[PDB]
From Swiss-Prot, chains A, B:
Lineage of origin: Eukaryota, Metazoa, Chordata, Craniata, Vertebrata
Site (Cleavage): 1-2
Regions annotated as coiled coil: none
Protein name (Swiss-Prot/TrEMBL): IL-8(6-77)
Species the sequence originates in: Homo sapiens
First and last residues shown, out of full length: 28 to 80 of 99
Disulfide bonds: 7-34, 9-50
Amino acid sequence: SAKELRCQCIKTYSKPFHPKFIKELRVIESGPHCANTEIIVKLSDGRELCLDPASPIVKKIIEKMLNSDKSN
Amino acid sequence: SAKELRCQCIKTYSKPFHPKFIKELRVIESGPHCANTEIIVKLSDGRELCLDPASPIVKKIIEKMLNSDKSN
């Protein structure tokens, strides 16, 4: 009975780990909405899902869109 | 009749473009071999393939493995 799940996820693929051994680093960097807009990965041959470990980086890449429009 | 194609690719997904509008940024960052070890992406709703636009960055992420072992 917790708040309705969010769009995709807010944490790592599912678990934290060394993202260095990631075979596929996927990043949901779509426009501004809710579907894709965070980080993602494919942990070597063990874990593979989205990615959002308290890393606002990717939020800054999506954030630059708005900020780009904030030139007037 | 050109040199046998390489492993996956050496350039972008297929074409260059603003990687900013990429919906999925995938990165083949596997160990050291030849399969996956470069950058990759999913250009918004238009282009989606690997990624290696003269960007050695990703090569530096894979390179840190060796260099990590070069501590002795």
